[PDB]
Design a protein around this ligand. Sequence first.
Ligand SMILES: O=C(N[C@@H](CSCc1ccccn1)C(=O)O)c1ncccc1O
Ligand SMILES: O=C(N[C@@H](CSCc1ccccn1)C(=O)O)c1ncccc1O
Ligand code: NI
Ligand code: NI
Ligand SMILES: [Zn+2]
Ligand SMILES: [Zn+2]
Lengths: 384, 384
Amino acid sequence: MACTIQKAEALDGAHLMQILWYDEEESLYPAVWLRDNCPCSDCYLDSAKARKLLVEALDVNIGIKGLIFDRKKVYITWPDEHYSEFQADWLKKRCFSKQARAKLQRELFFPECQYWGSELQLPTLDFEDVLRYDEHAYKWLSTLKKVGIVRLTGASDKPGEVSKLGKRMGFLYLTFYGHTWQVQDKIDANNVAYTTGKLSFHTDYPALHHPPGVQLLHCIKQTVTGGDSEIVDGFNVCQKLKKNNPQAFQILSSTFVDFTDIGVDYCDFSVQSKHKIIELDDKGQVVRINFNNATRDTIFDVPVERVQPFYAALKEFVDLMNSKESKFTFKMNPGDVITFDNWRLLHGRRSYEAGTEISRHLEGAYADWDVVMSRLRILRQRVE
Amino acid sequence: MACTIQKAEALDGAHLMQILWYDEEESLYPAVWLRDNCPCSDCYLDSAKARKLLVEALDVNIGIKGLIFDRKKVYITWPDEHYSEFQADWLKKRCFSKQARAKLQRELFFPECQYWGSELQLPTLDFEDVLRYDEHAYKWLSTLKKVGIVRLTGASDKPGEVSKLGKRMGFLYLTFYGHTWQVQDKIDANNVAYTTGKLSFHTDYPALHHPPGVQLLHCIKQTVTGGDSEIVDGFNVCQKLKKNNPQAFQILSSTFVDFTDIGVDYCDFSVQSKHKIIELDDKGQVVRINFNNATRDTIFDVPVERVQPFYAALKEFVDLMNSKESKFTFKMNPGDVITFDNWRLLHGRRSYEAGTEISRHLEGAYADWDVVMSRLRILRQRVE
Ligand SMILES: O=C(N[C@@H](CSCc1ccccn1)C(=O)O)c1ncccc1O
Ligand SMILES: O=C(N[C@@H](CSCc1ccccn1)C(=O)O)c1ncccc1O
Ligand code: NI
Ligand code: NI
Ligand SMILES: [Zn+2]
Ligand SMILES: [Zn+2]
């Protein structure tokens, strides 16, 4: 009833079209845009969903010669005698109103996320379920996007589980550490020679210009005492950060920091990058956090007068993350696989207790948000 | 001599360290920075070049308690009785002056690059020489970065060559088209029921938020008349535009256009993204171009009043690219490999002579600029 056309006209100048639907809603469409998106086989390929029409063959000052219509189609003719047909629902979807434009975007990028601090309820799902049923994989990825972390439980106690979640999404993000990477730790109890420390909050691989979108951490076998994992919602924190200290937020969202990483793994390497600890989009919203104090280079490209104030804003930031109001604590169990957003969440670890025995085997991997995102859309279509 | 300290003092407040080299230049260093990048094993992890000192342990209001020095080192004690040693040449490198910073930056990211036009002289190198000699590999990458393109010659006539180059840089960039894709065209000698148009200028894969940085194109077999390759230097162009049409430039470098791509190759997919055709850094410098009219979505999230102006401004951009002074034409031959910057150059193809035998076979691959940059950093240190 809203996708049905009541009145369609080319207005004045013939450079714009007005569609009035049976729900008393009006839409405006630029002729030049209509010409550029003619559904005709000569201009578009339905299969590849690509446009054949060349820009060179596009009169930016084009105007509608004439048009007729019915309830679900608009017929347009142009000066060069070119013919086009547009579907009512196709137009409606692409309405230039602020609301229609906003709605379509929501439908394309799943921008809704749920903020959280220490009151977070860690989402859970079954590893094998996510593999066999799409209803679940959809629940897995859509939750990962909204919340930023999902705990898949019930995986084997051997390597190769993250690889399976890889095929499920599409493919992992190959880095200098390889396709996957195994972490292994073993310290006998009562050993006075060793000393364990905590792990300050961070995001992985900030030494790359395009950091890994999501991380996959499978816990094969783990026997520890106080190695509780900790995590904070970078977005939530940033919001609170500017609200409680604009000066800090300013500096961190505008000062470029250099990150490096040299070594040999999948090959010899030497990476460097410049990132702003708090990256914002052109509209001022936090889109990614880039921070790993261990990889922040000793080189700092900025005038001396900026240095001290910078370290101050960083301090305030790290303190805000450590406040119990921001950090969620939990513990991984053998067979579990953690999956989170590395642009959003910052993770760390508590301090292993005393001289207690510690032994763990973990397998990790990264995935790109474009791959996950693509998978999410295909999956949302299979489930709905 | 420039790395030789004549005098080093902790200016009043002890929040800054002033050093005067035997060459008469004075370098300033903030106390908090020195204390943050302490070389001591307890704070820094030399072998890994990673910081092990936590931010929580860094007093942003710290000052130097006392210090002594010789011609090649500075020794500093801190209030909390911590001890530090600094290398003079190490400090000389990280000087906060404008020049030093800009200098060290150049060493890290190879910013240099020559703009070009129709008067371009295509850099060439031998395929096998690049594979065996690091000097030729350095010449290959440095030029690629600097000029935007490099033509390797001598590759075999069988697939699997662009793979050897990948293993030479580090590793290829896997996309939805596998690790490598192939193109095989074979239109018979004088076919009447078929026509071959031209390819407009474009960059590849704008549908990804992180488009492929470098493209590798191997010409395995090509038997064609006409259809010459056409490349253009986007950076040069973008600059000429800003000069001739500040409005067009302003629009293109500030409007977010949608790009889409759905299909199946390495697996099914439905990638969607938003990009400013002319991407600028935070200093107004063009750092990347994102354009492929085919994969530019029919969806356009922008207020109607901006539509026509945008279309008008793109036509400007495209017309400038097709200008006789902006494009460089060349024809690739069998056995050679074209390697170019997919973020800078835009490529197209001329129209094949009508009714002429068309027989092609090429193998392509993508690479990430960070992987290439790493190889480039590791090679410079091996040839220089
Ligand atoms: O955070 C890192 N590793 C830590 C944590 S990985 C396990 C983990 C993952 C997510 C949340 C809490 N703990 C470790 O090995 O214990 C890490 N990140 C980047 C590079 C090297 C690392 O050890
Ligand atoms: O530009 C594309 N292909 C064209 C050109 S690839 C050969 C080429 C590469 C670089 C410069 C000129 N020609 C073709 O197959 O003839 C292309 N790009 C992205 C997706 C599909 C394509 O066919
Ligand atoms: Ni980590
Ligand atoms: Ni192409
Ligand atoms: Zn048409
Ligand atoms: Zn120290």
